Design an enzyme around this catalytic site. Structure first.
Site, PDB file in Angstrom:
ATOM      1  N   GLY A   1       4.108   7.424   1.948  1.00  0.00           N
ATOM      2  CA  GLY A   1       2.839   7.680   2.589  1.00  0.00           C
ATOM      3  C   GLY A   1       1.722   7.764   1.563  1.00  0.00           C
ATOM      4  O   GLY A   1       0.530   7.715   1.915  1.00  0.00           O
TER       5      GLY A   1
ATOM      6  N   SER B   1       1.747   5.587  -1.027  1.00  0.00           N
ATOM      7  CA  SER B   1       1.678   4.207  -1.479  1.00  0.00           C
ATOM      8  C   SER B   1       0.289   3.584  -1.232  1.00  0.00           C
ATOM      9  O   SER B   1      -0.292   3.794  -0.167  1.00  0.00           O
ATOM     10  CB  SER B   1       2.708   3.348  -0.751  1.00  0.00           C
ATOM     11  OG  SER B   1       4.026   3.822  -1.077  1.00  0.00           O
ATOM     12  N   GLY B   2      -0.202   2.859  -2.231  1.00  0.00           N
ATOM     13  CA  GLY B   2      -1.500   2.201  -2.195  1.00  0.00           C
ATOM     14  C   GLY B   2      -2.643   3.086  -2.703  1.00  0.00           C
ATOM     15  O   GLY B   2      -3.729   2.560  -2.974  1.00  0.00           O
TER      16      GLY B   2
ATOM     17  N   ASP C   1       2.804  -5.364  -6.967  1.00  0.00           N
ATOM     18  CA  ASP C   1       2.536  -4.637  -5.759  1.00  0.00           C
ATOM     19  C   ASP C   1       1.060  -4.201  -5.718  1.00  0.00           C
ATOM     20  O   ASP C   1       0.698  -3.042  -6.006  1.00  0.00           O
ATOM     21  CB  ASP C   1       3.485  -3.456  -5.707  1.00  0.00           C
ATOM     22  CG  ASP C   1       3.490  -2.769  -4.366  1.00  0.00           C
ATOM     23  OD1 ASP C   1       2.984  -3.330  -3.385  1.00  0.00           O
ATOM     24  OD2 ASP C   1       4.008  -1.672  -4.275  1.00  0.00           O
TER      25      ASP C   1
END
Length: 238
Positions: free
Chosen positions: A186, A188-189, A93
């Site tokens: 929210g 994530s990343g 991911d």
């Protein structure tokens, strides 16, 4: 971020917000500026439509409500999702975003240093995770950039709390035995960064978990050191 507090200007100068301009403009994911023209984020942030022009990337910001039409933003020139990422699985991911224009480095907008492929995370105790994600499970996007301090746990410990094979050597987990502090939807990343000997390193990319901030349920991150060959190959000069 669950159990976090408000960050200050310049504290996390690599943190960016990935937003989509729909009827209202909405923050969907975090990211980390790793060079003038490159942002590192999670591949699953793009599980919707492949459209690049809908996205606006904001850097050097603290509060989402401060953003107005005159606030500068970056645009996407290219999205590079890891070749082995599948929407149906948690693995790999990770995604790179190449921006349309290089950003200059300022006190408010600066890259996070990358690790080396084999160098150790055992020198770190607690790391910091930041974002505008939910402050509780089934909560809402937070206006002011949140920060929380969380210890890393071993992969063997993490795998006790998740289904077999879901925690690979290319992931790292962080959490407290009795929970209460974690990343959430929210975030994530965005970054999981750790500091040792006065230097910050990007150790993880916020990826997934079972709910948010539950006891004996560490958050799961893509382990950046395990993708350094991919990152350097994909970002090299033309």
């Amino acid at each position: 971020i669950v159990g976090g507090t408000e960050s200050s200007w310049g504290e996390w100068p690599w943190q960016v917000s990935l937003q989509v301009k729909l009827t209202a403009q909405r923050h969907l994911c975090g990211g980390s500026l790793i060079g003038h023209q490159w942002v590192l984020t999670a591949a699953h942030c793009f599980d919707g439509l492949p459209l690049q022009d809908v996205w606006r990337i904001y850097s050097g910001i603290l509060e989402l409500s401060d953003i107005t039409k005159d606030t500068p933003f970056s645009q996407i020139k290219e999205i590079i999702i890891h070749q082995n990422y599948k929407v149906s699985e948690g693995n790999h991911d990770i995604a790179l975003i190449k921006l349309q224009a290089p950003l200059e480095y300022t006190e408010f907008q600066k890259p996070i240093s990358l690790p080396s492929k084999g160098d150790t995370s055992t020198i770190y105790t607690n790391c910091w995770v930041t974002g505008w994600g939910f402050s509780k499970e089934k909560g809402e996007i937070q206006n002011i950039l949140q920060k929380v301090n969380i210890p890393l746990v071993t992969n063997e410990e993490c795998q006790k709390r998740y289904q077999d094979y879901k925690i690979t050597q290319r992931m790292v987990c962080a959490g407290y035995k009795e929970g209460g502090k974690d990343a959430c939807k929210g975030d994530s990343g965005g970054p999981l960064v750790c500091k040792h000997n006065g230097m910050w390193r990007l150790v993880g990319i916020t990826s997934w978990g079972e709910g948010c901030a539950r006891r004996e349920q560490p958050g799961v991150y893509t382990k950046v050191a395990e993708y350094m060959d991919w990152i350097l190959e994909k970002t090299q000069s033309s």
